[PDB]
């Protein structure tokens, strides 16, 4: 039984959430923000990512060089990432360097220069990032997957934004973005590891007290996405490995089917030919794929957003003449979530997940990420006892009902990259979403 997550608020509406671990010597403190690229329109798309660069370019007090030195002197590091719905800025340090790190984070978020000279400098760095993501195949595949599934909608936009916007982002629109979005009621200060909650609350009162509150304070993790069945083919015969993602519209964080969808995902599971144990996994798809050498890997996912999600699988394969078999057998295993699954598969997947949801949190950064994610999506940290009860409530017959309304005979979003000549047209893929025998 892990120590209890303590939670306090400030007057502005900033949440402070902490989980202490007296066995470790480091601490991850940071700011989780319920805001990301999805909050941009088409004209300022890329702003959130642009700001992440300039946050480390110097403040009203410390210059870029002074900033570098201050963190070097602390001994730990700072890190940041911007997603579609979430922005994170954290600092890993020593136990007694926590007041320094909170002070630096408060500075870069509230009091950043955003000097025209630095905007102009980063504008090239970010332009170069557009031509180097091209190598990260998984990211290419998932960005096209969002673009097509949420065609012409805010969730469909990339985080980097178009080339055109990068050239036209001003300090004015940067300032406007962070003033509108980085408000106290949307922010959570998180501490995990060697942190005292009461000390962290005092540091929040000292540094984050003059944060703006939004005009209309909605609860944390408050949002209509209209999924498009569609495909993107990025054929490249010179690549040796095909990368394919297939997804349906999945579930939001607060869906009643959230846990049902996780169990369904665990029934298919993951596979990697490079891992020794993968040939012996219980998953039927794993067995088919390994015995027939159909793939190098597959990874089931159930990605959630505030008001929608994507549920599907990501495949990589060198077997270019049997892509058809790989996709065929994958979708036939999904069909069985509707037609065939019983207590045998469901109880097995529940066993595996009851541990998996706890295992994931193995370092202070993972714990902080868990507290921060849950507070910004659900408005609260869900205790392991509650999670164990929600998993236990999932029956085989919940899974069947969920798959019958979510997967069975449904439109898919499909992205193929690489030597995908063997990937059949949309209809033949989508025809495998049902079984004529059932």
């Amino acid at each position: 039984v892990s120590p209890k997550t303590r939670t306090s608020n400030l007057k502005n509406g900033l949440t402070i959430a902490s989980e202490s671990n007296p066995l470790v010597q480091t601490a991850t403190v940071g700011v989780w923000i319920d805001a990301g690229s999805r909050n941009e329109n088409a004209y300022n798309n890329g702003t959130a990512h642009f700001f992440e660069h300039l946050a480390f370019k110097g403040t009203d007090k410390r210059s870029q060089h002074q900033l570098e030195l201050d963190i070097e002197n602390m001994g730990g590091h700072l890190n940041a990432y911007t997603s579609r719905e979430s922005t994170v800025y954290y600092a890993k340090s020593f136990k007694d360097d926590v007041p320094k790190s909170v002070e630096i984070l408060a500075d870069i978020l509230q009091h950043s220069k955003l000097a025209e000279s630095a905007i102009d400098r980063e504008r090239e760095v970010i332009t170069r990032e557009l031509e180097e993501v091209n190598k990260q195949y998984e990211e290419v595949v998932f960005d096209h997957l969002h673009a097509t599934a949420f065609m012409n909608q805010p969730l469909g936009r990339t985080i980097l934004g178009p080339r055109e916007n990068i050239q036209t982002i001003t300090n004015t629109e940067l300032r406007k973005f962070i003033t509108e979005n980085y408000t106290a009621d949307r922010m959570v200060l998180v501490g995990a590891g060697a942190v005292d909650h009461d000390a962290l609350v005092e540091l929040a009162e000292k540094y984050f007290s003059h944060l703006p509150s939004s005009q209309s304070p909605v609860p944390l993790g408050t949002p209509i996405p209209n999924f498009v069945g569609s495909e993107v083919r990025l054929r490249d015969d010179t690549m040796p490995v095909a990368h394919i993602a297939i997804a349906v519209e999945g579930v939001s964080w607060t869906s009643e089917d959230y846990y049902t969808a996780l169990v369904a995902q665990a029934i298919i599971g993951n596979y990697d030919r490079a891992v020794g144990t993968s040939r012996h996994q219980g998953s039927r798809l794993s067995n088919i794929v390994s015995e027939n050498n159909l793939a190098n890997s597959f990874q089931s996912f159930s990605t959630s957003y505030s008001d929608t999600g994507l549920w599907g699988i990501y495949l990589t394969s060198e077997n270019t003449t049997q892509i058809d078999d790989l996709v065929h057998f994958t979708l036939k295993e999904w069909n069985r979530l509707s037609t065939s699954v019983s207590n045998l598969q469901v109880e097995r997947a529940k066993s595996q997940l009851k541990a998996g949801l706890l295992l994931s949190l193995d370092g202070t950064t993972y714990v902080a990420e868990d507290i921060g994610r849950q507070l910004t999506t659900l408005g609260r940290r869900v205790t392991p006892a509650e999670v164990e009860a929600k998993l236990e409530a999932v029956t085989e017959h919940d899974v069947r009902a969920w798959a019958q309304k979510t997967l069975y005979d449904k439109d898919i979003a499909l992205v193929g990259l690489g030597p995908i000549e063997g990937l059949y047209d949309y209809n033949r893929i989508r025809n495998d979403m049902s079984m004529m025998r059932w």
């Binding site: 892990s2 066995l23 480091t26 660069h53 700072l78 360097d97 541990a355 295992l359």
Partner: protein, 402 residues
């Protein structure tokens, strides 16, 4: 970690407040002890294959019912086998380790079909990074044998079933085994290990064939998949000051979209190159390395010159600020290493198997600017410098140029 002994096996456990336990068996069977090149890697990949009481298949299916995970790796010093599970499932995992050490079948088909192919994919994945290759090549030049043996099995030197069976006969013995339990009740682990590992052979301590000898030189690994360069300096007398020096010289940025304020980080300005100083203590010898990767051989060459200059400049004079920055970065590095399960296990493993007391992160020594500059001076004035170039080797620097 309360160090104790259970039926001749050294057991270290630290109770915690988490639903997740890590149990690691640390074996004195790393590559410095390898009888045959690559045999330690193969033995690592042979863990949790078929045993007499339980097949590999049955183990994996049951592991999935507990939702446990399996992690294994090989170092120059150890083989580490780690399981991660829910606290209550401790007896199962203790018994599984006992089956592996006492009753592994070691079948030819497992070697041909399962173990060797996985070992080969493991190495190819690591080599995708040219910096890995460069640092491996540097150890090979510096030590030749022992610490100079390859960690990983390679195709050019095939490991036979008899090789692995012989090595396992030595390694899988009470004298070469340490059990490390993170978030495990220490009294409960001792009771279980005492019943499960009672009939394990006593065996004898595995030893390095030959004394550690230091050599200078060059390695020129021609690849087509990226460029790297290691500048290593073999150390005859490993001292803790080299940790402080490695963290001082630094190289990686502590901040996104930045270079960093470390001397080596500042050597990469104007280039798409990265740099990392590392120090490897192996008890009886050490290696101080600076590895530089990048896509341009010309830029790597440029950084390499600035890197050796940085080391010389450090030998001249360090400021008090810089010495404090080194203490802070080093204390932090020590702390995060003791937290990460893989490295944690091997740290205590060393303490149990050898006798090298762990230096707690809160006891990491503060080195004065005098002590740091003296350490860098010794390195700049080394009689045996090693340089390993990987990639377009015709365009990378040579030792005599540096």
């Amino acid at each position: 970690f309360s160090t104790a002994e259970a039926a001749g096996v050294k057991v270290a456990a630290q109770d915690g407040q988490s639903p997740i336990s890590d149990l690691s068996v640390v074996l004195r069977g790393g590559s410095r002890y390898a009888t045959v090149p690559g045999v330690s890697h193969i033995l690592e990949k042979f863990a949790f294959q078929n045993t007499v009481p339980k097949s590999a298949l049955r183990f994996v299916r049951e592991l999935e019912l507990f939702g446990g995970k399996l992690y294994t790796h090989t170092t120059r010093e150890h083989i580490v086998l780690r399981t991660q599970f829910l606290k209550q499932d401790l007896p199962y995992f203790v018994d599984a380790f006992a089956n592996v050490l006492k009753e592994t079948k070691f079948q030819q088909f497992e070697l041909t079909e399962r173990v060797a192919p996985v070992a080969e994919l493991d190495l190819l994945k690591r080599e995708s990074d040219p910096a890995f290759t460069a640092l491996e090549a540097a150890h090979e030049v510096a030590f030749r044998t022992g610490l100079g043996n390859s960690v990983y099995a390679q195709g050019y030197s095939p490991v036979t079933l008899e090789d692995v069976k012989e090595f396992a006969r030595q390694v899988y013995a009470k004298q070469n085994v340490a059990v490390v339990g993170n978030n495990v009740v220490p009294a409960d682990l001792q009771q279980l290990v005492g019943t499960a590992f009672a009939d394990l052979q006593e065996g004898s301590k595995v030893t390095q064939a030959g004394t550690t000898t230091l050599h200078g030189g060059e390695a020129r690994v021609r690849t087509s998949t990226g460029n790297a360069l290691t500048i290593a300096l073999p150390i005859a007398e490993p001292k803790p000051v080299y940790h402080a020096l490695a963290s001082f010289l630094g190289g990686p940025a502590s901040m996104p979209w930045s270079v960093g304020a470390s001397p080596l980080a500042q050597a990469t300005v104007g280039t798409h190159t990265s740099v990392k100083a590392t120090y490897h203590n192996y008890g009886d010898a050490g290696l101080f390395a600076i590895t530089i990767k990048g896509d341009s051989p010309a830029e790597i060459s440029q950084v390499a010159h600035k890197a050796v200059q940085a080391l010389k400049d450090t030998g001249a004079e360090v400021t008090e600020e810089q010495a404090a920055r080194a203490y802070a970065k080093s204390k932090f590095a020590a702390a995060e290493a003791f937290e990460n399960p893989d490295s944690s296990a091997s740290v205590i493993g060393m303490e149990l198997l050898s006798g090298v007391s762990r230096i707690a992160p809160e006891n990491v020594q503060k080195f004065t600017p005098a002590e740091l500059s003296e350490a860098a001076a010794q390195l700049s004035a080394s009689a045996k410098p090693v340089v390993a170039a990987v990639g377009q080797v015709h365009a990378l620097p040579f030792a005599d140029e540096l």
